[PDB]
Design a protein around this nucleic acid. Structure first.
Ligand SMILES: [K+]
Ligand SMILES: [K+]
Ligand SMILES: [Mg+2]
Ligand SMILES: [Mg+2]
Ligand SMILES: [Mg+2]
Ligand SMILES: [Mg+2]
Ligand SMILES: [Mg+2]
Ligand SMILES: [Mg+2]
Ligand SMILES: [Mg+2]
Ligand SMILES: [Mg+2]
Ligand SMILES: [Mg+2]
Ligand SMILES: [Mg+2]
Ligand SMILES: [Mg+2]
Ligand SMILES: [Mg+2]
Ligand SMILES: [Mg+2]
Ligand SMILES: [Mg+2]
Ligand SMILES: [Mg+2]
Ligand SMILES: [Mg+2]
Lengths: 231, 101, 567, 49, 197, 325, 140, 132
RNA sequence: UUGGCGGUACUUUAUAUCCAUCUAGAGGAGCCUGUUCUAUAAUCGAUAAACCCCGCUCUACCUCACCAUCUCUUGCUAAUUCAGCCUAUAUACCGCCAUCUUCAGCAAACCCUAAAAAGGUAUUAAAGUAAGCAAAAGAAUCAAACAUAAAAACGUUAGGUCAAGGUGUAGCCAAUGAAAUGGGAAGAAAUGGGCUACAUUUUCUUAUAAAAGAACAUUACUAUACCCUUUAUGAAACUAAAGGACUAAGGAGGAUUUAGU
């Protein structure tokens, strides 16, 4: 019946099944598609031509009249649209370059860009941000049981002596990246470099239970340090 | 296409009752009285019985015109309670509002 | 009670800013799209009638039901032929008529005449229609006419009319001769076609030709047939060919029209005007005065459709007024158009825009600017969306009244009517604004207008790969910026003369120098010298010497200025 | 008349003057299902002989 | 092929001394581009003002009276005066009307929205006459009152005949007049069985 | 991840244009309604908009409005610092510059009164402004603790010797309590064709409504709906309810009442008459007596009416039996 | 229009017949609507129109009617939980007096053609006529 | 919890129109009725037939102007005249709207045997009452 | 560390509510109705609070989805190797709700911590801030208030509903589809809710609920059961009402439990 037909928004809402108990139960998956994407108003399977809707209203000074395409002409148009569908579908398939950090499946050592502009258009394009750890911590709650947050440790620096770090926590990873990235720009140390390429002297220290033993080295020695220290 | 095969059977019952309305009226009148001989009344009792069963107007059921629901219908709109609430709760019925008092 | 809304588009067009027709081309295109959508619905209704058959309207509305044009009577009988004739199918009716003759079944003479009417009127061709013609010697119409056993006056008359309609003048006249030989009598409609035939045919001698047409009129009285309006209108329409010799005959006809009791219609005067005021009239020195008498005769009268040339009258009358440069007469003609419902006879799409365009142009030329602006607001856009030349006439009128303060406003109006990118219009606006000096406030307003007209050139340049900045607009836009507190912008525009390789004019160059002296900026003064050197203008050297005396030049400036002087 | 509405709107959809989001949705589910090999069998050739 | 640009609203060109009846000659929907008023409608959000006219569905949902303004109604009624006819001056009171026109015929019309103009209630007609206006002898009035039963009201002395049995209103109207004529003539007739009361 | 429309703060040029469009709106609305623009007022505007845009929405905030921009647009708090960035007020960095600027003044006043050194009830029947009113005066938001402290400081000022300057100051924060006149509205005294005085009043109990017509002089003859009161009211308790008004004022056998009660039952009709007689008898008693009636319950309408039944419940309050488990 | 104005606007032809005109002693117009404000605006338009044509009019508000019904809120079970709906009808009665049949047709057309959407009219004309000529004289 | 015609809260990024924002209990209080006919007034007939026409007329306009509707349409019945007032986005060219108006009017006048008119107010984009 | 829990103390608590107080009930009899059980060739769903006069504001045929028998095979539509499916999964969903609940929170952007898994209040103030949703306000019950309704976020119960309709996946396509006719039974059974009675503040009659005259324990009170007649609806009485007699049990109900400010 024509009266039991529902709109596209309501059809995809049910079919996708995003809302529901499945989402909280961790449940490739079906992909929403727009069916009006390539459809032109006035174009039908029968191939009629409607002046002023899907064809020119006047052609070479002649007022057009209603017409229909031949079976051969319509078959071409139908096949042409089928091709245009394949072209659009292929676009989604493409996967493009990114750079891995310390490992392919880890965020550690991945550049996420500069911090956001400041209050008075203070750009930080000369600063780069690097991820040092991404953790999925959990807090038990009565409402949700186990609730998950993303704790991200990032570092920032301009490669010219100024650097800082911060931790950002959120429920979404993208938000934790923004929080840490813009927080770290507020904790910028200035580090003294001997001739711009090394530390001024050997440095040994213990921070809590971590021990670090740095050594001053000549030019061309390169960075021979923990991957995080290299970052 | 109608909503379902049940609405289709109901539609045919409604169109066969309209065809047999005068006939079932004239014959049934001969039975609903005490003025005519009982022999005629006993015979009219069978002429009305012989008519097709779907001519009988008590086999019609009022169903929601849009969902074909047999019960829960409101006769002024011919819609089920579920369909009526969807149109009413969206401001699409002219003058229907929620009752607060 | 209600009158036309002066600030609204015609009622046909949708009342939305996005859907209001900006130009005259969109006006016709928008209506054709509306008519096209109406035809798309009527096609679906007439092709799937089973879905448009339930009738829920009390009283019943016949005009909202599906139409059926194909015969539904299958049996081959005189009645079935009558149906096809009523439906106006020409080929199918001929087949069933021949089949009736093949069987030999009787066919009524009246029914046989209804077939000839359809064939004669449509000239053997199926009625024109839209969905997914000379007379032919061997055709169904003439063949059926011969097969007819019994002939009557109507039968011959139908042939005479159909032949004349389909340009068979010579044959039609021959058919009339037979009607006289049979001693039958023709009707008024047939006499009108015969007169239309003699006129269309080219006769060597006018005097013979006129005496022939009169002979048809004399036989109209012998046969006790009284003439109608069309009869006289047809004769006058024929007389428009002989402008010189048709004047005395034409007046006599109109006098005879009143004596008979036929009332001259707007069409009847449309022909007398054409005959007395030729469009290609070399003798404009002393035109005729008849137009004044006609308007006096028709003053205050109301007219109704009674001919097919009634619409033509109003468009022609205004044209004669514009030729005579009489604005009082134009008001009388327009005043006649407003009486009663005469507005309905202004004309169709081709003639409606000519009448008002001719009318408004005459107002601007010969009317006070104060009144001219009243007419401007009333007619536009409600009546007609004018072409750009109308605005050039309005702008020129403002210049002649010394009211150039309104030129910026006219520009804003023009943009709504799709003249934003019109080169001719943009050049007129800038030219008048920058033709002479003005008080500071007016110059500032003109400068804002000049900036707006500059944006049109700029946006057009960006969109189009190949764009040329016309030289005169560049001078006008630059001068206006200097005069209106936009000198900084004018210095940037100085570079555009070199980018587009346009030769700066001597006046503009010295104007830039005058402003520089007041500013006291030697650097800016030297900038003018740079451009003069580029185009090798002779005055450039004199201008460089002028800078030397106007400003104190630093030693660095002396070297830089000397280089440019050498260049 | 449910037959008039369902038929009339179907005819309009084939003329390009009406768009049925529901039908276009179903037309693509059938297209995809046929590719997967779950399409409707032909009559008389069902799984049971 | 850039997108089309909408023109500025035509309210900008409207003078404050315009002929508004011409702007809205007949009932039309609210057009924000034709109504030169800064009207706002909508329950405002916190720290917000009511919504503006452009794109306002609530203003569109209103049956506006812009076409009916005090200036229009007076200009309309001035034209409609030629249609009207003058009530006879002599009939200055209701009692005066009962004297010369004792019969009251009630007919009802119904106006609704829909494709059908048909209403079942429009056929009914009601005749009301006072027995005092009728020329009735002492015998006749008693016979008229017994026959009509509850149609007669002693308090008001009014006979009410309501006829809806016939399909059309012209038939029901003629039937009620017929019912009165038969009752009147029958009331005057005296039957022999009446002597046994 | 905040992506919602920001506050569309209204600049002075914005509100200035909104006032020019409103001024042009009035001239058009006046021309539509055929009135004179010069005299057209806010009251006429509201009436015109209600005619031209009939809306029957119950909430009147949601109805069409063509009001002055000042009334609709909230007053924008002005910038608190200049171009150099220096705040205009010395208490800007407190976060409540206006609350603390006011508390600074009142504390300085208190100190001078205490250093420098009669009945304090200069104003009576007044209240301290509520927090919402104070917030408007300060053009800022306060907490409940901020209001409580402000009042305590103002009270201390009143305790101390106060010159006329202080009395004017504390006046600003005292709002005249519009104590309602909880007193009877005495009815007029009409006169009949005979010339006797009589008063009339209506009464409503439950669904019953009565219209009594007490007469100044009578022998105690009460007629209800043209019937006697012993006949109409066969129950003693209903007659006692009619006795209560007169017995209270010791006016038995001195008035003649004519009642007309329609609706309700026997008890609801006696109660409606009791109120109708009490309100009519007010015109024939002293003002001290009228207060005696009002304070004994004779002049108060009874608001107790039957409560609607609830869906899913046996009655107004009765519930369905909670089924055994 | 500032300068361009119609000259002699065409007006409909009204021809006086020789038939006598109907005489309506009363003419009650009961308008109904869900909205009170629409009735107020229509009442003003109708009363103004009557006063401009010379008709005598009175207006009152018959008591409003509210029709309420209950439905089941859930799609399945949960009987005790319901939802209630109501339809409100409001009335304005325009009682006209002493109208000829020509005045009542022009007035009713003018006000019926301007009847807002959602508004229903119930005209109740009360004609007054003489007695039937047969009834006038008793005939045996 | 009540789920009827309530556009639920998200994270402040969901634009909602005035019609969508208000739940059913605000009908006749803050928002009016989209259709106005006389068929639900007391002592009036043909409510069922007016209601069925509304359902169809709304589905017809959605398909005939696909993606071009800014808000729900408003249906106004006066006498036998039907008036459709639709807020439409300015996506389509101007001439296409003239075609669809002529088509949709003629088609619906021959389907319901009444005079049907289409009134289109074009908006630059959907009007957002609040972000919820 | 956070949550949860504790037959761990401490303080404050529910407002027809945990106990207590008050009134009428339920639990006993008779019936009406749901459910389970038993059972039938013969649906489905709900089935602790939050099912049990529930989906049904409603089943003699129809409704109907069930069982038995016979029959149809392009089998509603403009077209379609297509139509149709009350076929499985509510643990894929939309839609529309229940429950906590008239509970007071929820989520977004920030800021702070000798590091942060998380936490963030003190008013004579000690690191928290400023917007959104809910509550509040407002509107409705046509003066006023109060009250009652309505409203009530995020979540909890993979809560309810593939049988309102729609729909993802899987399945049937001479059958899991379509249609006709006839059936869908009952109970020494348990249980939930209702109705009526058990009487004297009662029974019958006139009245109008005031008053009066009779009745008043073996059938006096007391059968909406069974049975017997008549009427209403219908084609069909198997239904409902009204009379008639027949009349059995019941004598205020064990623990226990429901509702009412
Ligand atoms: K669900
Ligand atoms: K089957
Ligand atoms: Mg890898
Ligand atoms: Mg189905
Ligand atoms: Mg039934
Ligand atoms: Mg109770
Ligand atoms: Mg309790
Ligand atoms: Mg059955
Ligand atoms: Mg069956
Ligand atoms: Mg099945
Ligand atoms: Mg679930
Ligand atoms: Mg609850
Ligand atoms: Mg309130
Ligand atoms: Mg609330
Ligand atoms: Mg479950
Ligand atoms: Mg289940
Ligand atoms: Mg009693
Ligand atoms: Mg029977």
């Amino acid at each position: 019946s024509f009266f039991t037909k529902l709109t596209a928004e309501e059809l995809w809402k049910g079919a996708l099944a995003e809302t529901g108990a499945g989402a909280r139960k961790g449940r490739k998956k079906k992909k929403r598609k727009d069916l009006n994407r390539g459809q032109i108003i006035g174009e039908g399977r029968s191939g009629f031509l409607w002046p002023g809707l899907n064809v020119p209203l006047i052609k070479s000074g002649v007022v057009q009249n209603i017409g229909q395409r031949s079976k051969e002409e319509q078959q071409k148009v139908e096949a042409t649209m089928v091709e245009q569908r394949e072209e659009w579908d292929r676009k989604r398939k493409i996967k493009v370059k990114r750079e891995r950090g310390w490992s392919g499946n880890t965020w550690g050592g991945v550049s996420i860009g500069p911090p956001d502009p400041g209050p008075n258009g203070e750009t930080y394009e000369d600063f780069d941000t690097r991820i040092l750890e991404v953790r999925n911590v959990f807090n038990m709650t009565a409402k949700e049981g186990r609730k998950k947050s993303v704790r991200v440790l990032v570092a920032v620096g301009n490669g010219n002596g100024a650097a800082g770090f911060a931790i950002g926590k959120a429920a979404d990873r993208g938000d934790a990246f923004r929080k840490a990235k813009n927080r770290a720009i507020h904790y910028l140390h200035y580090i003294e470099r001997y001739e711009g390429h090394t530390i001024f002297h050997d440095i040994s220290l213990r921070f809590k239970r971590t021990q670090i033993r740095m050594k001053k080295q000549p030019r061309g020695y390169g960075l021979r340090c923990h991957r995080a220290i290299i970052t | 296409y109608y909503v379902d095969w049940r609405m289709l059977r109901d539609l045919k019952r409604r169109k066969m009752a309209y065809e047999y309305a005068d006939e079932r009226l004239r014959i049934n009148s001969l039975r609903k009285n005490t003025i005519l001989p009982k022999d005629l009344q006993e015979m009219a009792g069978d002429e009305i019985a012989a008519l097709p069963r779907d001519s009988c107007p008590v086999r019609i059921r009022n169903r929601c015109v849009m969902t074909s629901r047999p019960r829960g219908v409101k006769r002024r709109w011919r819609l089920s309670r579920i369909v009526f609430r969807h149109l009413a709760d969206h401001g699409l019925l002219s003058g229907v509002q929620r009752a607060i008092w | 009670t209600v009158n036309r809304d002066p600030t609204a588009a015609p009622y046909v067009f949708h009342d939305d800013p996005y859907l209001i027709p900006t130009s005259a081309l969109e006006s016709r295109s928008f209506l054709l799209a509306k008519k096209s959508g109406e035809t798309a619905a009527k096609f679906i209704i007439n092709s799937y009638p089973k879905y448009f058959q339930k009738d829920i309207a009390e009283p019943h509305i016949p005009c909202l039901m599906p139409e059926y044009f194909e015969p539904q009577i299958e049996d081959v009988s005189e009645a079935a032929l009558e149906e096809r004739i009523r439906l106006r199918k020409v080929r199918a009716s001929v087949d069933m008529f021949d089949q009736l003759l093949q069987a030999g079944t009787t066919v009524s003479l009246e029914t046989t005449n209804s077939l000839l009417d359809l064939l004669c009127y449509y000239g053997d061709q199926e009625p024109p229609a839209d969905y997914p013609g000379p007379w032919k010697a061997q055709n169904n119409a003439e063949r059926i006419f011969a097969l007819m056993p019994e002939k009557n006056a109507r039968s011959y008359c139908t042939m005479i009319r159909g032949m004349v309609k389909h340009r068979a003048y010579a044959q039609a006249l021959n058919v009339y001769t037979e009607l006289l030989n049979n001693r039958l009598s023709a009707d008024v409609y047939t006499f009108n076609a015969l007169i239309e035939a003699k006129t269309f045919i080219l006769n060597e001698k006018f005097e013979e030709k006129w005496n022939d047409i009169l002979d048809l009129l004399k036989h109209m009285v012998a046969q006790k047939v009284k003439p109608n309006l069309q009869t006289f209108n047809t004769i006058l329409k024929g007389l428009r060919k002989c402008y010189s010799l048709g004047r005395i005959p034409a007046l006599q006809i109109l006098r005879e029209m009143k004596h008979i009791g036929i009332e001259p219609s707007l069409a009847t005067y449309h022909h007398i005007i054409h005959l007395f005021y030729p469009r290609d009239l070399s003798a404009i020195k002393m035109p005729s005065l008849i137009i004044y008498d006609i308007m006096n005769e028709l003053e205050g009268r109301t007219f109704s459709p009674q001919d097919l040339d009634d619409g033509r009258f109003f468009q022609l009358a205004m044209s004669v007024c514009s030729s005579l440069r009489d604005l009082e007469l134009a008001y009388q003609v327009h005043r006649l158009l407003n009486t009663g419902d005469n507005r309905k006879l202004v004309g169709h799409d081709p003639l409606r825009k000519v009448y008002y365009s001719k009318f408004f142009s005459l107002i601007c030329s010969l009317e006070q600017i104060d009144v001219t602006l009243k007419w401007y607001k009333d007619l536009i856009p409600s009546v007609f969306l004018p072409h750009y030349q109308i605005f050039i006439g309005l702008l020129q009128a403002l210049d002649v009244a010394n009211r150039l303060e309104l030129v910026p406003q006219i520009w804003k109006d023009s943009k709504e009517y799709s003249h934003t990118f019109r080169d001719a219009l943009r050049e007129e606006v800038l030219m008048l604004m920058a033709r002479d000096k003005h008080p500071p406030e007016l110059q500032v307003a003109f400068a804002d207008c000049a900036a707006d007209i500059k944006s049109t050139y700029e946006d057009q340049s960006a969109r189009q790969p190949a764009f040329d900045w016309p030289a005169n607009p560049l001078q006008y836009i630059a001068v206006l910026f200097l005069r209106g507190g936009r000198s900084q912008e004018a210095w940037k525009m100085l570079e555009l003369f070199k980018k587009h390789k346009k030769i700066p004019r001597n006046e503009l160059l010295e104007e830039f120098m005058d402003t520089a002296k007041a500013s006291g900026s030697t650097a800016l003064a030297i900038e003018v010298v740079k451009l003069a050197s580029a185009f090798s203008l002779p005055i450039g050297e004199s201008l460089a010497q002028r800078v030397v005396m106007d400003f104190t030049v630093d030693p660095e400036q002396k070297e830089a200025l000397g280089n440019l002087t050498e260049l | 008349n449910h037959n008039t509405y369902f038929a009339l709107m179907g005819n309009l959809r084939f003329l390009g003057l009406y768009r049925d989001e529901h039908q276009d949705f179903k037309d693509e589910q059938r297209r995809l299902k046929k590719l997967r090999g779950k399409g409707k069998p032909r009559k008389g050739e069902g799984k049971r002989a | 092929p850039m997108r089309r640009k909408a023109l500025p609203p035509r309210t900008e060109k409207m003078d404050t001394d315009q002929d508004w009846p011409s702007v809205y000659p007949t009932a039309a929907p609210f057009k924000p581009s034709a109504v030169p008023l800064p009207v706002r409608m909508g329950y405002p959000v916190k720290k917000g003002v009511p919504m503006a006219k452009e794109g306002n569905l609530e203003l569109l949902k209103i049956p506006n009276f812009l076409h009916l303004t005090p200036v229009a109604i007076k200009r309309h009624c001035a034209a409609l005066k030629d249609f009207c006819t003058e009530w006879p001056a002599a009939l200055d009171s209701d009692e005066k009307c009962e004297e010369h026109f004792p019969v009251e015929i009630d007919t009802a019309d119904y106006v609704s929205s829909g494709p059908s103009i048909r209403n079942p209630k429009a056929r009914a007609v009601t005749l009301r006459v006072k027995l005092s206006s009728l020329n009735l002898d002492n015998h006749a009035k008693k016979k008229l009152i017994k026959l009509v039963g509850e149609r007669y009201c002693k308090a008001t002395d009014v006979l009410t005949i309501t006829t809806d049995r016939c399909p059309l209103k012209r038939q029901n109207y003629d039937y009620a007049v017929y019912l009165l004529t038969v009752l009147y003539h029958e009331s005057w007739k005296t039957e022999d069985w009446e002597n046994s009361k | 991840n905040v992506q919602a429309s920001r506050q569309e703060s209204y600049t002075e040029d914005f509100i200035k244009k909104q006032i020019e469009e409103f001024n042009i709106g009035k001239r058009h609305l006046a021309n539509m309604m055929g009135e004179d623009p010069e005299t057209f007022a806010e009251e006429d505007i509201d009436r015109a908009i209600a005619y031209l845009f009939p809306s029957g929405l119950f909430e009147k905030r949601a109805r069409p409005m063509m009001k002055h921009p000042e009334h609709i647009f909230p007053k924008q708090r002005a910038t608190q610092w200049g171009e150099d960035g220096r705040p205009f007020h010395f208490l800007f960095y407190t976060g409540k510059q206006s609350y603390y600027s006011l508390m600074h003044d009142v504390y300085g006043k208190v100190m001078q009164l205490e250093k420098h050194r009669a009945e304090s009830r200069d104003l009576i029947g007044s209240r301290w402004l509520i927090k919402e009113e104070l917030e408007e005066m300060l053009v800022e938001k306060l907490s409940d603790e901020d209001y409580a402290q402000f009042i305590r400081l103002l009270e201390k000022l009143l305790t101390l010797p106060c010159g006329p300057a202080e009395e004017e100051f504390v006046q600003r924060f005292r709002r005249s309590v519009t104590i309602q006149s909880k007193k009877q509205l005495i009815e007029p005294v009409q006169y009949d064709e005979q010339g006797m005085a009589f008063s009339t009043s209506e009464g409503r109990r439950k669904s019953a409504t009565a219209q009594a017509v007490v007469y100044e002089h009578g022998s105690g003859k009460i007629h209800v709906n043209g019937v006697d009161y012993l006949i109409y009211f066969p129950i003693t308790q209903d007659r006692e309810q009619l006795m209560f008004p007169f017995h209270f004022l010791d006016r038995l056998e001195r008035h003649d009442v004519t009642c007309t009660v329609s609706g309700g039952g026997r008890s609801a009709q006696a109660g409606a008459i009791r109120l109708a007689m009490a309100r009519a008898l007010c015109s024939f008693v002293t003002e001290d007596e009228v207060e005696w009636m009002r304070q004994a319950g004779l002049l108060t309408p009874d608001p107790r009416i039957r409560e609607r039944k609830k869906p899913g419940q046996e009655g107004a309050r009765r519930k369905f039996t909670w089924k055994k488990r | 229009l500032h300068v361009d104005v119609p000259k002699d606007v065409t007006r409909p032809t009204i021809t006086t017949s020789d038939e006598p005109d109907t005489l309506y002693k009363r003419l009650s117009i009961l308008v109904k609507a869900h909205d009170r404000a629409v009735l107020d605006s229509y009442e003003y338009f109708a009363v103004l129109a009557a006063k401009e044509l010379g008709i005598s009019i009175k207006v009152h508000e018959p008591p409003r009617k509210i029709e309420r019904f209950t439905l089941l809120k859930s799609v399945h079970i949960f009987k005790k939980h319901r939802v209630q709906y109501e339809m409100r009808t409001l009335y304005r009665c325009l009682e006209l007096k002493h109208l000829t049949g020509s005045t009542a047709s022009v007035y009713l057309e003018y006000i019926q053609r301007n009847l807002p959407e959602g508004v229903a009219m119930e005209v109740t004309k009360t004609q007054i006529q003489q007695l039937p000529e047969h009834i006038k004289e008793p005939m045996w | 919890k009540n789920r009827a015609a309530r556009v639920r809260v998200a994270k402040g990024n969901k634009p909602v129109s005035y019609e969508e924002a208000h739940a059913p209990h605000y009908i006749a209080h803050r928002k009016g009725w989209l259709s106005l006919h006389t068929g639900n007034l007391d002592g009036e007939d043909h409510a069922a037939e007016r209601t069925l026409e509304d359902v169809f007329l709304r589905k017809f306009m959605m398909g005939t102007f696909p993606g071009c509707l800014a808000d729900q349409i408003v249906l106004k019945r006066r006498a036998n005249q039907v008036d459709i007032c639709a807020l439409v986005l300015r996506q389509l060219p101007a001439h296409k709207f003239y075609f669809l108006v002529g088509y949709s009017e003629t088609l619906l006048s021959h389907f319901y045997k009444c005079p049907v008119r289409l009134h289109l107010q074009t908006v630059p984009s959907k009007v957002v009452y609040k972000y919820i």
